């Protein structure tokens, strides 16, 4: 009963276009394919804009005021968005491939590099109400005979430098009256001019060419004319300049060559501050901070994004995205981290809060098909088509074990015992389940009985029963543990593609090729419900398809499904452009999500394979925090979360309940009534007010008197609030009060409070323990130093 909204894209940090630093210098804006991602470097957080282009993005620019962000795709279609409120303002089509866009430092005007023409336009006023035609063109400039490589604004918003492929740099004047001030074309370079910049005084003009030559231009008597006073050459053996940026205040020149290495130079003395290589792929884009201390570099081939502190030679940010589509995903049991797998064969571990890759594992030779965590969460397991299963200890980030079959069986699915002592994998070629011992690494035995390739496996978290499904049109429940082992086969209408296990372990849901989600009772081995899927699925006709999409049977089934931890919903995905969220008890569609809107992707709308990228979701999973779910797709990991909560969803509301009345209970010191009434309104701002206004003395009294029905809500509110809140002692005092007062009730109903308790335990384990660990470490260091005898 929650609204999920796209929040951020993990798995890609840079794809193409130009990276731009926020004016304040604390945030970095990166185009990621069809969307733009913003990374908060100081706070170590990230988000991705919800607005979406028709095609991949080409260029981007943010105003110094930090209010207007313009994004233009490869077709020239522009989207103007408020940076502050993250909402689209206007759609404009420039009808031409714009190479670069840059706002004037005044912010009033913005210049477009459109082919061999420079277009300067007036910036819409954000404070004004929405206008239909806010874009008015100030001027169009037609001087270059070839496409413009890049453009640079003067610090005073009075002149613009543009470099074109005519081996020429030409300066204009923004004001018509000052046309005589700047109407000079600079020539002399033997290759394409990549950058033209002003000095801080703007007396000197620096121009750089692709060949690696830097010319310093000055206005002097031979009566006075611009001339090249000095010439500096980049003596790269074969590397060619691809991107250039210059900061006038500090006189820093950062140039990225095609060989994949960048050099930091001081102008005009041309001193090599530093030279580093990010790899063999070209350095696509380079940007400089306002202060000039952070340099952002990007390579499109491997999707690299690196922020460099050249002053201290430290790395603020260094991330690499998956080269391939992500085949599978797994959340850590607490949800603090998520692990992703790609067709390359490399696993990556990501922090949810930071949204950055903490480690990458490249032991697997071939594509990693599945990834799963143990119930403890310390260990992770993965299966790959190379024929191995590998166990990873995430506290020490080491592969402490590897499992393999006798004849190198290719594995596609993996499941692990909750006790973390048995691991089972399945294959498309053997029809048999291989079982290993985690402690020993030996093959215990192989579970036989399937006629078909095993498509999926899953252990019950509580009952530890193993459910296996196949293209055999059947499902088998294995009671492997115990003196005697039993198998209960249940036959199904069609080939099973996905299987999910209810957290209680009493039911099993499976997706079939017909497009049916059928739920079966494990103990009784009888069906309890069914959901239709064929109609709800959205599949777009492929450009190579000779058919109508309605007649197409390409993908009207879900290849992946998963329950909600609350257990009343299932998230399903497949080789299609739709994610459908179903309600199990009523068998209805809660909501459907469009995965992608990039017209480049095939499905959004004799020796050569006609092969192009397709929209598809490889795997889906609910966050254990019960606030988000992540879907692995070709672009990357799409995370939809319910954090915004702009919706008004009152519970047991009455006429007497009012935000003013809730405050009135507070000024009257009726804390319990205020807290209850706030929860009935279910307004977070009101709940936070009541929660922080309760004195510490009255917490135990309020805690003992909370009605049971509101108890699951308040425990959840504390857990998610506490994870980022600064009031640890206040929050812990609350949790102690609630736990001591209602501990028995929670034990009686573990499943009802399962998600709430887990969120609480995350806050106590991941931040609270870390604080005290430093505190107790400090205490013992003190006792050693003072008690101890001083050195001679």
């Amino acid at each position: 009963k929650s609204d999920f909204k796209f929040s951020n894209l993990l798995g890609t940090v840079y794809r193409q276009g130009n990276i731009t630093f926020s004016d304040d210098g604390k945030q970095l804006l990166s185009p990621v394919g069809n969307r733009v991602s913003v990374f908060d470097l100081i706070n170590n957080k990230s988000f991705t804009f919800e607005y979406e282009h028709r095609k991949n993005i080409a260029a981007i620019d943010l105003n110094k005021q930090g209010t207007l962000l313009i994004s233009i795709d490869e077709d020239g279609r522009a989207i103007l968005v408020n940076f502050k409120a993250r909402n689209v303002l206007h759609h404009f089509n420039f009808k031409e491939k714009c190479s670069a866009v840059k706002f004037s430092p005044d912010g009033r005007l913005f210049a477009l590099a459109s082919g061999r023409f420079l277009q300067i336009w007036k910036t819409p006023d954000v404070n004004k109400d929405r206008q239909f035609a806010p874009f008015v063109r100030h001027r169009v400039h037609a001087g270059h005979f070839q496409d413009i490589t890049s453009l640079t604004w003067s610090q005073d918003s009075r002149f613009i430098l543009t470099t074109s492929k005519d081996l020429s740099a030409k300066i204009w004047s923004v004001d018509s009256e000052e046309k005589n001030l700047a109407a000079t074309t600079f020539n002399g370079h033997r290759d394409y001019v990549m950058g033209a910049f002003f000095s801080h005084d703007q007396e000197k003009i620096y121009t750089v060419s692709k060949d690696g030559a830097v010319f310093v231009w000055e206005f002097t008597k031979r009566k006075y004319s611009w001339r090249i006073t000095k010439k500096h050459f980049f003596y790269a053996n074969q590397a060619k300049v691809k991107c250039v940026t210059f900061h006038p205040a500090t006189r820093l020149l950062a140039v990225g060559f095609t060989s994949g290495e960048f050099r930091l130079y001081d102008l005009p003395d041309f001193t090599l501050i530093q030279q580093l290589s990010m790899g063999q792929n070209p350095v696509n884009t380079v940007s400089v901070n306002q202060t000039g201390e952070w340099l952002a570099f990007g390579s499109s081939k491997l999707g690299q994004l690196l922020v460099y502190e050249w002053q201290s030679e430290s790395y603020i940010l260094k991330q690499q995205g998956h080269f391939d589509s992500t085949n599978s995903l797994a959340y850590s049991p607490d949800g603090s981290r998520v692990v992703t797998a790609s067709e390359d064969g490399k696993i990556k571990v990501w922090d949810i809060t930071s949204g950055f890759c903490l480690a990458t594992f490249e032991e697997h030779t071939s594509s990693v098909t599945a990834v799963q965590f143990a119930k403890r969460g310390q260990v992770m397991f993965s299966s790959s088509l190379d024929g191995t299963v590998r166990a990873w200890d995430l506290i020490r980030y080491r592969n402490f074990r590897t499992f393999t079959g006798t004849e190198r069986i290719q594995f596609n699915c993996l499941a692990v015992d909750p006790s973390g002592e048995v691991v089972c994998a399945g294959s498309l070629d053997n029809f048999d389940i291989h079982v290993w011992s985690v402690q020993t690494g030996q093959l215990l035995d192989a579970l036989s009985g399937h006629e078909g390739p095993v498509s999926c496996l899953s252990f019950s978290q509580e009952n530890s029963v193993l459910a296996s499904a196949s293209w055999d049109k059947t499902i088998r429940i294995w009671s492997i543990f115990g003196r005697s082992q039993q198998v209960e086969p249940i036959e199904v209408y069609s080939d099973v593609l996905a299987l999910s296990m209810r957290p209680d372990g009493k039911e099993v849901a499976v997706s079939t090729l017909k497009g049916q989600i059928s739920i079966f009772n494990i103990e009784d081995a009888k069906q309890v419900g069914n959901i239709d899927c064929r109609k709800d699925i959205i599949s777009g006709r492929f450009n190579q398809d000779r058919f109508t999409a309605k007649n197409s049977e390409r993908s009207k089934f879900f290849t992946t499904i998963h329950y909600s931890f609350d257990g009343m919903a299932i998230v399903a995905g497949g080789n299609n452009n739709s994610i459908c969220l179903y309600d199990v008890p009523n068998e209805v569609l809660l909501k459907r999500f469009i995965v992608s809107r990039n017209m480049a992707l095939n499905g959004t709308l004799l020796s050569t394979r006609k092969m192009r990228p397709e929209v598809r979701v490889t795997s889906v999973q609910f966050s254990p925090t019960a606030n988000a779910f992540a879907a692995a797709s070709t672009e990357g990991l799409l995370i939809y979360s319910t954090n915004d909560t702009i919706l008004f969803d009152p519970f047991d509301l009455d006429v007497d309940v009012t935000p003013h009345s809730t405050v009135e209970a507070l000024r009257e010191k009726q804390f319990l009534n205020a807290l209850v009434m706030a929860f009935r309104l279910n307004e977070e701002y009101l709940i936070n007010k009541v929660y922080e206004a309760i004195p510490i003395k009255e917490i135990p009294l309020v805690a003992s008197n909370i009605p049971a029905i509101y108890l699951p809500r308040i425990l959840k509110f504390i857990g998610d609030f506490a994870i980022e809140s600064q009031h640890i002692e206040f929050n812990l005092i609350w949790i102690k009060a609630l736990l001591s007062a209602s501990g028995g009730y929670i034990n009686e109903h573990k499943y009802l409070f399962s998600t709430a308790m887990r969120s609480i335990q995350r806050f106590i384990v991941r931040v609270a323990k870390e604080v005290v660990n430093t505190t107790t470490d400090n205490k013992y260091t003190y006792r050693f130093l003072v008690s101890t005898d001083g050195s001679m």
Partner: peptide
């Protein structure tokens, strides 16, 4: 001025 102008031991 440019027309683009502003305004051994021991």
């Amino acid at each position: 001025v440019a027309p683009t102008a502003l305004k051994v031991l021991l």
